[PDB]
Write a protein that binds this ligand. Structure first.
Ligand SMILES: O=C(O)CCC(=O)C(=O)O
Ligand SMILES: O=C(O)CCC(=O)C(=O)O
Lengths: 211, 207
């Protein structure tokens, strides 16, 4: 909760911004002039290669601070591509307002420090996921992250609340569409997960951890 | 600048291989790595290890403590000989509440670690093991590189096993790929240190 209440107040109030699914929040090349708080939805940070291929660096969940490059002072240019993965609501602030707002309303550098601490650890989770030698573990590991980040209770289990193309999954776990199609499909038959409308449900993740 | 030094100081020596913290430890402290390299690892009891982060100089770590306690789940080790400052949370939380101008540097410090961890994702993201190696080697050149006529010398005693545990591979493959890299006149291993000639050329391998 806390982060919302910090950002909002940052003399006139801060308006929430809407972003349609697929709309860019920032392009590689833009000046890194801003910090953001993702309020609702999912934002995908991606690295684009001159080769054409993209890699997902982070699928960020709600109440996440991002754009964090702007805090490094000296400005700089974005090198990642920030996109609304789902429909997105966020606050953005120019860097300077954050410097002062933190200084003055003192309690809340602690909220930003916790916000940023949260992000470091989450990324380190993603590394652990990407390091598994066998791709199936990666998938399961990734799916489990998506359950606690985007999971919504169903009668039939926990349901990752995202339109996830297999291609999307491919670009996050460092694989290809064909492999993930086969792995998923083999978790479907194993009665370990279920898929409808591009959304995945993992039964008893507690269990999926144990196998 | 760095100036994180200048905040923290208001030093501990650690021997190559000594533990800074183990899983099971309480998460009661924050650290600033002043000199050397610290390796955060995840131990898959039972048996093997995976490197989550090789941290370079002037890095804040132990960051779990800032989440308000908990227990460490990673293993913090002096990869080289290490100099660091450590502070209990309470002194640090208090300090930041009493003197709330020292937060900007911490915010930049933590931002940097996010950006650096994201690099390691770019690396492990590659499907091709050779690209991972090159990607990883290049990071090590920025982070631990010394200058050198034709390129850059990673200033670490790096076992191939170490490299294996960072890039998600095995010792046999690293030793092999380094060979192919070497035999292409792209790196050298002299007095136990990897030197990568003309990295910028090689960094165009990606983009
Ligand atoms: O992880 C983030 O917050 C995005 C990184 C960033 O700010 C950039 O690439 O400019
Ligand atoms: O990345 C770090 O700072 C170390 C993570 C940590 O503090 C822990 O595992 O307890």
């Amino acid at each position: 909760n806390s982060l919302l209440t910090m950002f909002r107040e940052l003399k006139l109030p801060l308006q929430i911004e809407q972003f349609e699914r697929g709309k860019t929040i920032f392009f590689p090349g833009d000046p890194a002039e801003r910090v953001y708080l993702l309020v609702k939805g999912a934002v995908k940070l991606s690295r684009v290669y001159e080769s054409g291929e993209e890699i997902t660096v982070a699928l960020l969940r709600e109440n996440s601070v991002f754009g964090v490059l702007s805090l490094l002072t000296g400005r700089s240019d974005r090198f990642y591509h920030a996109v609304a993965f789902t429909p997105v609501q966020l606050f953005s602030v120019p860097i300077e307002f954050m410097q002062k707002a933190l200084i003055e309303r003192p309690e809340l550098a602690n909220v930003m420090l916790q916000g940023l601490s949260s992000r470091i650890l989450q990324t380190e989770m993603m590394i652990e996921t990407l390091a598994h030698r066998d791709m199936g573990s990666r998938l399961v590991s990734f799916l489990l992250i998506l359950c606690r980040d985007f999971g919504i209770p169903s009668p039939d289990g926990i349901t990752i609340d995202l339109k996830l193309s297999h291609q999307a999954i491919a670009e996050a776990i460092g694989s290809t569409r064909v492999t993930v199609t086969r792995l998923l499909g083999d978790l479907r038959e194993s009665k370990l997960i279920a898929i409808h409308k591009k959304r995945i449900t993992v039964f008893n993740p507690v269990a999926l951890s144990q196998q």
